[PDB]
Design an enzyme around this catalytic site. Structure first.
Site, short mmCIF file in Angstrom:
data_model
loop_
_atom_site.label_atom_id
_atom_site.label_comp_id
_atom_site.label_asym_id
_atom_site.label_seq_id
_atom_site.Cartn_x
_atom_site.Cartn_y
_atom_site.Cartn_z
N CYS A 156 0.75 -1.23 0.00
CA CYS A 156 0.00 0.00 0.00
C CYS A 156 0.79 1.29 0.00
O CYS A 156 0.58 2.14 -0.87
CB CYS A 156 -0.98 -0.04 1.15
SG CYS A 156 -2.17 -1.32 0.78
N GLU A 157 1.70 1.47 0.95
CA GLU A 157 2.48 2.72 1.00
C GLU A 157 3.44 2.76 -0.18
O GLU A 157 3.83 3.84 -0.64
CB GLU A 157 3.24 2.85 2.32
CG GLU A 157 2.40 2.61 3.59
CD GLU A 157 1.26 3.59 3.72
OE1 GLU A 157 1.09 4.44 2.85
OE2 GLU A 157 0.53 3.50 4.71
N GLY A 158 3.83 1.60 -0.69
CA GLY A 158 4.72 1.56 -1.83
C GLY A 158 4.02 2.15 -3.04
O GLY A 158 4.66 2.81 -3.88
#
Ligand SMILES: Nc1ncnc2[nH]cnc12
Length: 233
Positions: A156-158
């Site tokens: 997700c944060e990637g």
């Protein structure tokens, strides 16, 4: 309802960088070009999400399917090999998924998985992510929290941050794994706010925004190289 290209986590021939790349391309197909805003703006939020991102991760031995909502690149749940769906939440909440699913017992926020602690501590990498997938597919019905939180930052944060997809890709095949820097985590946990300032900066590109100042982000320029995708409204 776009299914993501499988990601062979254990197969060292596939980079983490491509996985991400490939996904954003898919995601972007649904974003809109906003004025004064560098990054593709995500689909607007809806109590009941419309567009979903089904990204499966498979190892030599197993695989699970990730259920992520496009509107805010949030992980809502996963699918075990045997076709069972686990959704972040407690009994009584409302479901978003997808074929008879079984409340996971806890929400999917950082405070929920590892409160009071900073992302700098969650260790990540091909190994850790392989460990994670296999481990999460061997699930029926709380060390599946520490497992979800890796995939959360890794996937997700990637997708959201360049800053994350860069530090993670660079250390993906590292023996000791890879973790974000103190600052990164903070920034990562402020996706919501940085995004709001992306909008604020579209209006007044000059405006000084202490919240961004307080995160080590000088202007809309600096934020543009940190975040890849933005949010809302
Ligand atoms: N489950 C999740 N998915 C994506 N981003 C998140 N940030 C915190 N929790 C998350």
């Amino acid at each position: 309802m776009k299914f993501t290209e499988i990601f062979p986590v254990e197969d060292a021939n596939y980079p983490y960088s491509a996985f991400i790349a490939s996904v954003r391309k898919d995601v972007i197909k649904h974003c809109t070009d906003h004025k004064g805003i560098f990054q593709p703006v995500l689909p607007p939020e809806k109590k009941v999400p419309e567009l979903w991102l089904y990204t499966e991760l498979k190892t030599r031995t197993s695989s699970i399917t990730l259920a992520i909502r496009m509107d805010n690149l949030y992980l809502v749940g996963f699918r075990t090999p045997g076709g069972v769906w686990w959704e972040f939440g407690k009994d009584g909440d409302t479901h978003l998924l997808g074929d008879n699913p079984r409340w996971l017992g806890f929400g999917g926020r950082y405070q929920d998985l590892i409160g009071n602690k900073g992302l700098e501590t969650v260790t990540m990498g091909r190994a850790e992510m392989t460990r994670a997938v296999n481990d999460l597919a061997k699930k029926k019905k709380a060390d599946t929290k520490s497992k979800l939180v890796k995939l959360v930052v890794m996937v997700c944060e990637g997708l959201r941050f360049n800053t994350v997809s860069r530090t993670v890709d660079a250390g993906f095949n590292s023996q000791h794994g890879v973790t974000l820097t103190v600052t990164q985590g903070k920034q990562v946990q402020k996706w919501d706010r940085i995004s709001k300032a992306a909008f604020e900066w579209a209006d007044h590109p000059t405006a000084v925004i202490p919240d961004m100042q307080k995160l080590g982000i000088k202007d809309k320029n600096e934020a543009a190289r940190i975040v890849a995708l933005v949010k809302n409204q």
